[PDB]
Amino acid sequence: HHWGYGKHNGPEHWHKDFPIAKGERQSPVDIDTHTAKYDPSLKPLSVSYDQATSLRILNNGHAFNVEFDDSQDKAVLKGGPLDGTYRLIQFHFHWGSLDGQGSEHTVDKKKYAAELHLVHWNTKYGDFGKAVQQPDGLAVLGIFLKVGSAKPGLQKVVDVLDSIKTKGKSADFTNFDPRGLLPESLDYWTYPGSLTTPPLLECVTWIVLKEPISVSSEQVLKFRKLNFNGEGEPEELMVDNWRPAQPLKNRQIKASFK
Ligand SMILES: CN(C)c1ccc(S(=O)(=O)N[N+](=O)[O-])cc1
Ligand SMILES: CN(C)c1ccc(S(=O)(=O)N[N+](=O)[O-])cc1
Ligand SMILES: [Zn+2]
């Protein structure tokens, strides 16, 4: 009886196995754009993805992860609210059963069709498993998806999904350039939070871009053909794999932009 996104194992149940679900710095949150304050002492983000080395794509039964070689500073996030160097390890998405839901963060209560998470770990902690035990261990760059024009840089991901339909399937996924998933502007909101899936560790500096990317209805429809189940088991479409907004508690959301 493991955690998931059903009625009987979804977000409202996670606190039983993971009591930090009710903690002081949980994610996602609603971003109230009129309450977020411009912080002129933030810097610009530095997203350095030119030497990124993608390796594999995995259906883990909750989402799919595009995994990177993180054994050197090949693809790193720095600047903005961050001190030091954060190495890209994987990205994944959260998405809905229909276009009006799917994002984890919300903006003035607006839900986007999906949300991309580029996960990075603080190299001062040496490995990812050590980093998740630290309050400044991870930096997640979150990017909203809206349905409209196709995103050309997403299509290589879309087309490999047929090969990883079910939980536990992987495929080689080399030479994928995550720069093709970025919007034009790097304006962002930032706040201290958590993983949005169990174990819900409070180790993340969230950096949520203001500008969504556009993907086509056909692209998101292909996400919705994935399965939560394993091969040879009854089909459960991988949709609505998002955690709703959590209480902001004693946090401030800061804006990089006026
Ligand atoms: C040789 N064939 C049949 C083949 C090759 C690649 C693809 S793909 O769309 O890049 N990947 N995929 O499906 O998972 C599909 C079919
Ligand atoms: C420790 N790793 C596995 C990890 C960290 C953070 C995330 S997330 O971007 O907060 N989304 N999510 O939790 O579902 C995902 C994975
Ligand atoms: Zn995520």
CATH class reads Alpha Beta
Helix percent band: under 10%
N-to-C series of helices and strands: HEEEEEEEEEHEHEEEEHE
CATH fold descriptor: Carbonic Anhydrase II
Distance between the termini: 47 Å
Apparent shape: globular
Overall tally of domains: 1
What is the CATH homology-level superfamily?
Answer: Alpha carbonic anhydrase
What structural class should be given to the helix and strand makeup?
A: mainly beta
Any idea what the radius of gyration is?
17 Å
Described by its quaternary structure, the protein is: monomer
- Spell out which ligands are present: 4-(dimethylamino)-~{N}-nitro-benzenesulfonamide, zinc ion
| Content of β-strand | 25-35%
What is the annotated CATH architecture? Roll
Task: Figure out the total of helices.
Answer: 4
Number of DSSP strand runs: 15
Biggest sheet details: 13 strands, mixed
Keywords: Acetylation, Cell membrane, Cytoplasm, Disease variant, Lyase, Membrane, Metal-binding, Osteopetrosis, Phosphoprotein, Zinc
Site (Fine-tunes the proton-transfer properties of H-64): 5, 60, 65
Domain Alpha-carbonic anhydrase: 1-257
Binding site for Zn(2+): 92, 94, 117
Q: How would you describe the overall organization of this protein?
A:
It is classed as lyase. The entry lists the keywords carbonic anhydrase 2, N-nitrobenzenesulfonamide, metalloenzyme, inhibitor, lyase. The chain is mostly beta strands. It has helices spanning 14-17, 128-131, 155-160, 217-223, and strands at 30-31, 37-38, 45-48, 54-59, 64-68, 76-79, 86-95, 106-107, 114-122, 138-147, 170-172, 188-193, 204-209, 213-215, 254-255. Strands 2, 3, 4, 5, 6, 7, 9, 10, 11, 12, 13, 14 and 15 form a 13-stranded mixed β-sheet that branches. It binds 4-(dimethylamino)-~{N}-nitro-benzenesulfonamide (2 copies) and zinc ion. One 4-(dimethylamino)-~{N}-nitro-benzenesulfonamide (SVO) is lined by residues 159-160, 162-163.
